[PDB]
Amino acid sequence: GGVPRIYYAWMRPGSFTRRRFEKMRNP
Amino acid sequence: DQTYGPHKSYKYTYMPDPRKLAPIETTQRSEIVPQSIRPPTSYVPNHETFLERADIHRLRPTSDFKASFKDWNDLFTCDKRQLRVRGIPRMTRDAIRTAVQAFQNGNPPERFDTKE
Amino acid sequence: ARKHGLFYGKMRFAEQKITFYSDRFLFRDLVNRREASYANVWEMDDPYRFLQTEQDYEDYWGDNYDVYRRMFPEMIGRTGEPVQQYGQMPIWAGPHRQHANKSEHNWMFAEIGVNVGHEALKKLELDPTNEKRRRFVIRQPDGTLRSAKMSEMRAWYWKEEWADFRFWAPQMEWGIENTPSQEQYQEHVPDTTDADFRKQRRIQSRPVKWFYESHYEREVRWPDVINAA
Amino acid sequence: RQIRPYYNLPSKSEHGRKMTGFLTPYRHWMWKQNELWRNV
Amino acid sequence: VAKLQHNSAPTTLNFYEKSFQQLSDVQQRQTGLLIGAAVGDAAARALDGYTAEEVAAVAAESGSLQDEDEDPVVFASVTPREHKSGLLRHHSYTFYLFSQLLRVMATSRGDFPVQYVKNEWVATARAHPDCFVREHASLLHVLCITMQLPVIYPWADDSTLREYASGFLEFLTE
Amino acid sequence: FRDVEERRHSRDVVNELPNPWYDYVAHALPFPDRDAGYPDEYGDLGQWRAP
Amino acid sequence: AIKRSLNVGVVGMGNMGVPIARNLGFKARSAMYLQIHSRALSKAKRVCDDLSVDGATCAMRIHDRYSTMTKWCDVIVLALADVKASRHALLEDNESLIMNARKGQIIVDHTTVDAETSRECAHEAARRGAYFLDAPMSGSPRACFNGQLLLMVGGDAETFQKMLPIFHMYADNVFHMGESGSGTAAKMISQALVASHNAAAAEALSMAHALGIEDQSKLVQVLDASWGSSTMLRRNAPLLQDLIRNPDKTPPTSAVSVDRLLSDLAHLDASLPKRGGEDEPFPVFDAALRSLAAASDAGMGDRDLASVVHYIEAGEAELRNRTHVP
Amino acid sequence: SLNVGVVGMGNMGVPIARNLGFKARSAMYLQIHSRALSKAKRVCDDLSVDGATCAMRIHDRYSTMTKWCDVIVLALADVKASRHALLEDNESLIMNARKGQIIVDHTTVDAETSRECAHEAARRGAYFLDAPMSGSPRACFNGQLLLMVGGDAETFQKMLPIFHMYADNVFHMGESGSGTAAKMISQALVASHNAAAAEALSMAHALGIEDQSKLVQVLDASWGSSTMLRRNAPLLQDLIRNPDKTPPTSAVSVDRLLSDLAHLDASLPKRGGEDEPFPVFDAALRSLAAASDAGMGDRDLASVVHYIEAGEAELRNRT
Amino acid sequence: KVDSFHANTQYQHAWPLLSHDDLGNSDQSNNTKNIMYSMYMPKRNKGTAPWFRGADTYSVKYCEQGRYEYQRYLMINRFPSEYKKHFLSFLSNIRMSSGSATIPQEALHWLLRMIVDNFNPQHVHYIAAMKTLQSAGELDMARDVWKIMERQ
Amino acid sequence: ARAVIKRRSPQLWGAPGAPIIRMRGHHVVWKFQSYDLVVEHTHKRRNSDIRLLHYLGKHCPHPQKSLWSPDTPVAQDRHLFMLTTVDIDAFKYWFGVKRCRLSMKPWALLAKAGLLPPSLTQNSKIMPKPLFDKESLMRYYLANRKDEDVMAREKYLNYENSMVKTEEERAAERPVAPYL
Amino acid sequence: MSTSSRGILIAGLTNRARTQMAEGILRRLTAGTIFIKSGGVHHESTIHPLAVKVMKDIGIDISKQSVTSLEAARRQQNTYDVYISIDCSYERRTLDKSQPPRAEVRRRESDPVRYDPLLVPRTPSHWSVGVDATDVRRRWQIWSPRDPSIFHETSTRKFQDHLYEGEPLFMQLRQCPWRTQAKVSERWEMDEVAIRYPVERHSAHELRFVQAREQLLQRSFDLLTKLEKHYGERLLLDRALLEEFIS
Ligand SMILES: [Mg+2]
């Protein structure tokens, strides 16, 4: 739906993009 | 000072395909084959006489466009795009262009008028 | 080249292949190929020894390296193939039709058919030592009939977008295990009396100038001069 | 298509075509010349 | 390094200039025995038959060199004497049998017997009888013809090359 | 027109080169001489009709 | 003594400098290092961005200060808008290009200036050891895109022979007028002829409307057949007919303006000698000057030269008040 | 077919009749009229001894020319002769016009004369075209003239093969009265561009430009280019660098231009309310008038470079 | 004015050397930290992606094989009436007279197409081929027919 | 041979006529128009699943940029390119053995490939057509005519067969002393 | 006096050697009274130094002239009167521009193979030339990829399919069929002299400039004699070059 197909690889905990998102939403 | 682009170690920052930067040479057909103009003979002394001799079909009123040309050279230098520009319908300008190309090949417009 | 509003990925492998650990022979082939390969290749090594002029050096390494490396996947002793031109058939109308072959653009013509156009046989159909080579021709705008270049011949097949930066074929081992024997090639038993296709192609290759001076065993000698005799 | 020039034999007939296919000997001669140039 | 586009500078100076880069190191020596004999025979064509003193008179009568002109001995502008038959005004009679042997060698796709070339060699001697009787069975004319024989296999030894050339040395001396 | 053209073609040094498009036919058999891999003789995903 | 490419810089990204920089970026294939100067770095970044996206054949480099532009470039080319901007960039600034010129540099000025400015520029460039060429350009930015510009180069002849391969990338008719200052005088005479032929075509189409000639293109063909043809008439006659037949219609803005032509004719009048402490009379040129002044005094000096026509008699009003004073 | 009658034999009248005798291969009939019957007999003999392919007639009055010819073409000397022949005569061509006749006037006349001629020809039922010719007498002999035809459109389309016998550039200006105005506008532009080129070369000599051969090559590629600038510049170089040198006599003179420019101020509306609604036109007119009375009237149009300041003389003192 | 609005909203600056992925992957010796993304893409695409099979090689056996070595021996049986029809048709095509529409080499051709189409040439076909080539003076082609019979 | 003739496509000698090599088009715009060099009948078969005899290839009438110019720069390499594929062996089979017909545009396209001479309609408009007279033709024929046997052997090599064995090959084809 | 000639255009392909020598000859014989504009198509060149030295042997200094194309005169094409096309013969023309020219077709009169003059006609001289090789003009176009109509993947404003978008500054050539509108239009067939052949001495390359100079002296004398009968004036004012030409 609103989520893309690369969502589970983008937001996987421990990955580079998920750590960047956690650093962005909490500096 | 600074080079364009954040990389500054590349000649092209967006890095296109190197076939995009390859040049394109060109050669006109006039360098290959010339275009000659035959003078008006005694059978067709004018350009309106040439349009009258090409007036054969009912749906190709060739002799109705005598005022659409300046002289013999203006008739024999106009291609089909310039005939479209001057306001000539498709069948009439096709007949005019084929008559001019037949006269350049050695065939004068000597055909029977099939109207009646 | 990267576009603006989208994200890209990276290929882990270039091809979907079978692993070399699945068989002992593929493993031995990989170890023998890594023996015959470099670890790092630079501008002074033997695959880059064909750059004998500094103009070719600046042409290869400058502004066309992305095209020059995309020609052939394996590193060979050159970058393409030499271009040779063909003869024009005689036009019996004479100079009335000598203008018609010269045009504005280059006209490239490629072959198709039952024998020609297979992606699995691409390096064999572009082999210049193949007598059934896929025929290409290019008419220049001045009327010259020439053959196609290597990239021009590879443009008519499917894309091959990988490159080998290690293997160099003069570094192959040839003395201990890789010993091709003539008796192995004699096991096919190629004979001229049992099959005459090779002699027929040799007859098709040689000129037929002798057929007109047949009546002019009888063997052809030099012309005898009567003025000096 | 067979060309009908204006100087062919006219068929003065109101029940059919106004021009026949009967040529002039000059038309015969130039048609022979064009025939040879196609024969090559 | 690159110059500005000016005075309509050509990309390549010859058709086969960049095609020589697409050969291996032995194939440049294979074609060097063929094309190098074609360049030298064409360069010494206008001074063929001249003595050692007449060649020095050509280099002495023209002493104007702007350092981009080459030697006036090579590709001379002198007037030839018999001045020629048809094709032989650019190459000698020895080169006419050389190019005919190369044409058979290119179409035979490898080694070939002497009988493939015997009919083309006697046609030029029948057409040029004056050049035939001057050069037949001489050491200079025979060696120039069979010079292009190790292009077929340059890694051959002397036993293989002299055996293959022996059929060609017979007919050139017969 | 044939004799003048054949004389100037024999005297021409440029057009004496062979032309593979003009000189011969490369292959005239209805089947190719070597296997290109095809056919497959098996079905795949989404194919119900086999054979 | 390092074998390298030529460092060529273009100073000023304006109406005409941007197509000059684009022609130098496209048509120079790895033969020069291109430098782009502007007062704002974002404009040079935009020019280099468009050149890199459209696909250029050389590497480019942005500048913000004239000192780096002086120390980097072997050839400097200035295409600016005003004589004040060129005099600031060449002479008046502390980091100016001619005052800090290195030995062997070549500075070409394409901006139309006065005679004394180019004289002092060439004199101080020869004093510094560099070379100065003044080459005022004639043409539209669309004509600069097609590579057809008129250049009148004054300066050294050997420098002109060196700069011809760069001049041929954006200009077609490149002439060498002679010593320094001759191309400026040629530009002054050409713009005087522009103003005179513009006023003549203005009154010609006014006579065509007053005498009842509807179509203008057939009149253009007749004048091209006769001796009364000119370039400004063929350029202006559709706009002149649309402005005269619609007398309330406002003219459009063009690349050339009334104020730019008036500033160039003011440079010509400052460079023209006086005889006996008074101005040499020139009637048609002064009449065109009156029409241009009446067009510029109405606030429509940003628009095209066809805007002259609605103030033609108004220029004579400027004469008549100057008649009315004792 | 249609009969053709040419009226008036002068310096420009005779090659039109000669080209009508040459090109009409016994298809259009030719009749010849002039101011005297001896001149018509002379030009008919001159057409007869050099080779005439069609029959030609000689007439002394306009009545037989009206009753015999459907197309009448007049090439006369001055405006008064054309006004006498077309309207003021008792046996006039327009006052005794036949319905369907086509009368073409090649004389450079005023706009009110062409208006009266077209109005009375439309009242009689005929069609009047005014087409003033521009060109050289040898260019008329070779068949190159410029014609600006005003009148009816279908009458212009009927007259195109007749106009193409002695003129290559024949354009249709539109309604009658607009063909005679095009020559006035063209010669006004000729005078204005000549004055502009003379003052530009005077300023070029003032600025100290020694090379004029490269200056005109620059100016022809600029936006201030004109054909008069290409025409007068090698003469103006000698007339400026040698001011004591008298200008040479040419074919086109100052009085020949002023005779056409004297039609324009009579053809223009009232100018006295603003006293100058045409600055550069009268600025060129005053220079031409100062060159006329000084003794250089019969000489070339480049003689106005010595009377540039004198055109200021009627501007400072009259104001 | 039309060029100042159209900025670069389409391209982006290229990848630097030794760069990473947008997902965080990189080309190192240890690929345990890197992952594949082929299972996140849709399973079937209408058409062909620019990265679809861009580097795909085939076996060495395809380019080292000789000619006509892949053809297996197939026993194409047929009706005996079809045998009679094809034998009579081949015998009629072999025995064609050499006029201006038929060269004698066709007498050697229609025998060869008899073996390419997997028919066994009977003795009457060899007799007809040798007699037709002997009547036209082609003795070497008749010996070629005999060698064809011997090689069968 | 119909009561009401199809007015827009008339042909000769009924259907299906002689096989002809044509260049057929698609029902698309000109910007994506390509041509198919095909072998078909004189009348197009619209009642079949086999609408053509053989497909000789595809011609693209739009010029492409030379994407191979830095490979090896030859003369006139940076010009545009017209891409065409031609089945050579099928064309020679349908031309020589089957004796197909040819339209003028495939004839010009194959003359660009070196397979055929330039067509009859490719006119050099600066050179007029020749004028023949039999006396000059007879004088040229009697000035230099070939021998009868030489012309016969030339026709035999060109039309009948070109691989005729020499005596040195006949001496090799014969058997040896265990059978001889 | 001011001549009746509105101008003279000398068209070429490069405007380097032959048209620069023709401009220097015609300007001397007319004594500069007629405006003469020498132009070309490819202007990215300088005047050849052998063209300056050979013209200096007469006394004409064409070094002050400049290489300039005809693009400023194509808009004013109907304003000029005389049009001259100096172009090579189509039987001798080569497109590579680096080789000696070919041999023309030889015909029989009353070893190169000669043709029959009735079977191969010789392009009769009463015909006129409509479009020559010098009748082209440059047309610069750029398809920019930052245009959203060109950046779209289904677009025909590109010369390829899958490599990139648009095309950076390609040049095409149009045709100018306007030389027949001029009053006098001629075509001068002369071989190319501005390009040196494979190996050739400096005196041999200079000798071709002298042969091209005497052909330009003959053709300029025939042109101005034709123009004197067209206008009716005297255009051969300087006959100091003609007394060395006739004698
Ligand atoms: Mg020039």
UniProtKB/TrEMBL annotation, chain B:
UniProt KW Mitochondrion keyword: yes
All copies of domain Small ribosomal subunit protein mS41 SAM, residue ranges: 47-106
Broad class of the protein's primary localization: mitochondrion
Presence of the UniProt keyword DNA-binding in the record: no
Coiled-coil positions: none
Subcellular location: Mitochondrion
Keywords: Mitochondrion
Gene Ontology CC: one annotated term: kinetoplast
Family: Belongs to the mitochondrion-specific ribosomal protein mS41 family.
Protein's recorded name: Small ribosomal subunit protein mS41
Taxonomic lineage of the native organism: Eukaryota, Discoba, Euglenozoa, Kinetoplastea, Metakinetoplastina
Residue span relative to the full protein: 10 to 125 of 187
TrEMBL record, chain C:
Protein name according to UniProt: Uncharacterized protein
Automatic annotation (TrEMBL), chain D:
Domain of life: Eukaryota
Name of the protein: Uncharacterized protein
Residues shown, of full length: 10 to 49 of 440
UniProtKB/TrEMBL annotation, chain J:
GO cellular component terms, semicolon-separated: cytoplasm; kinetoplast; mitochondrial small ribosomal subunit; mitochondrion
Designated name of the protein: Uncharacterized protein
Organism: Trypanosoma brucei brucei (strain 927/4 GUTat10.1)
